[PDB]
């Protein structure tokens, strides 16, 4: 029997599934450590590796990209978990090696690959404390090209009145996602600041792991793919909506939580996002 992880229910993805919309024909690049394409609860459509010493994007020697992928798009069937957008066309864009780290040029090469291959959505459950002009230019170009770009806000927690959102989440063109738990409380590690845009579940998130396994991970890495998967549901229902419109629909229909410094606009609600008329609940 399949299980629906609590976070998929919490963002109201089942409301879209019951309307008949599951992300079909929407191309989502998971820019990450690869995706284990042998997992029976995932279908990987394509991909490419930018990691010079690990040339196979369908081998995930870390586990992180495979977990992120399952939150986006674990298959709707009688096993494992269910993804937010279980019919999405899932692309493994490997830019991190086994050790969980990548050079800026590798991430940029992956973003460029995604643009060149007409991805509709990019998820980047990744980050660092400094930006670069070339990194900003790559995400800006992806957004200018029509791609919805979503990233983890970072796991730096609070630091007085200072922003702790990392890059590329901190760039205006990228939707920075923080983490809440099942009670809608901000996770203590979730980064904070005026760049924090929306929140999604990021505590004890069950998803796919390599070698046909499942497990619960924590992090803004886990929150980000709920929003990338939500973008794919929205596009499957409104295939002509632009990235601008998808982004506004998610921002404009959140459930407001606390102060925006800590919570951004609040918890995404994909049921409300995918209606024509938007307001907060």
């Amino acid at each position: 029997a399949q299980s629906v992880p609590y976070g998929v229910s919490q963002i109201k993805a089942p409301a879209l599934h019951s309307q008949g919309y599951t992300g079909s024909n929407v191309k989502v690049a998971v820019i990450d450590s690869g995706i284990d394409s042998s997992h029976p609860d995932l279908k990987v459509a394509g991909g490419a590796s930018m990691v010079p010493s690990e040339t196979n994007p369908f081998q995930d020697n870390n586990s992180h990209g495979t977990h992120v992928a399952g939150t986006v798009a674990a298959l709707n069937n009688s096993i494992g978990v269910l993804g937010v957008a279980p019919s999405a066309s899932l692309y493994a864009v490997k830019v991190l090696g086994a050790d969980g780290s990548g050079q800026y040029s590798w991430i940029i090469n992956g973003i460029e690959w995604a643009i060149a291959n007409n991805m509709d959505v990019i998820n980047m459950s990744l980050g660092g404390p400094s930006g670069s002009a070339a990194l900003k230019a790559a995400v800006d170009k992806a957004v200018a090209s029509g791609v919805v770009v979503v990233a983890a806000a970072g796991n730096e927690g609070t630091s007085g009145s200072s922003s702790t959102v990392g890059y590329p989440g901190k760039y205006p063109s990228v939707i920075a996602v923080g983490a809440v738990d099942s009670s809608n409380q901000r996770a203590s590690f979730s980064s904070v600041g005026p760049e924090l845009d929306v929140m999604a579940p990021g505590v004890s998130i069950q998803s796919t792991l390599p070698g046909n396994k499942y497990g619960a991970y924590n992090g803004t890495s886990m929150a980000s793919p709920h929003v990338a998967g939500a973008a794919a549901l929205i596009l499957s229902k409104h295939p002509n909506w632009t990235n601008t419109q998808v982004r506004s629909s998610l921002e404009n229909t959140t459930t407001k939580l606390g102060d925006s410094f800590y919570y951004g606009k609040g918890l995404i609600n994909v049921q409300a996002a995918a209606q024509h008329h938007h307001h907060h609940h």
Binding site: D32, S33, N62, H64, H67, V95, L96, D99, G100, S101, G102, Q103, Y104, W106, I107, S125, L126, G127, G128, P129, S130, A152, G154, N155, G166, A187, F189, Y217, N218, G219, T220, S221, M222, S224
Partner: protein
């Protein structure tokens, strides 16, 4: 319970590992280059150490 080591910035990676393992003997330590991009999962058992090209600590070590 100590979860950040700002006093280790500028020390060798060797001294950092020794100190962190005194405070948190079960720590899973990984050494990575500073100025890279990394996964954004949160692991209470992990301490990443970010080093410069001379193998000195270049960012405050913390749990996560």
């Amino acid at each position: 319970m100590k979860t950040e080591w700002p006093e280790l910035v500028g020390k060798s990676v060797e001294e950092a590992k020794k100190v962190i393992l005194q405070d948190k003997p079960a720590a899973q330590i990984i050494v990575l280059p500073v100025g890279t991009i990394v996964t954004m999962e949160y692991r209470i058992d992990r301490v990443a150490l970010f080093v410069d090209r001379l193998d000195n600590i270049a960012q405050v070590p913390r749990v996560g």
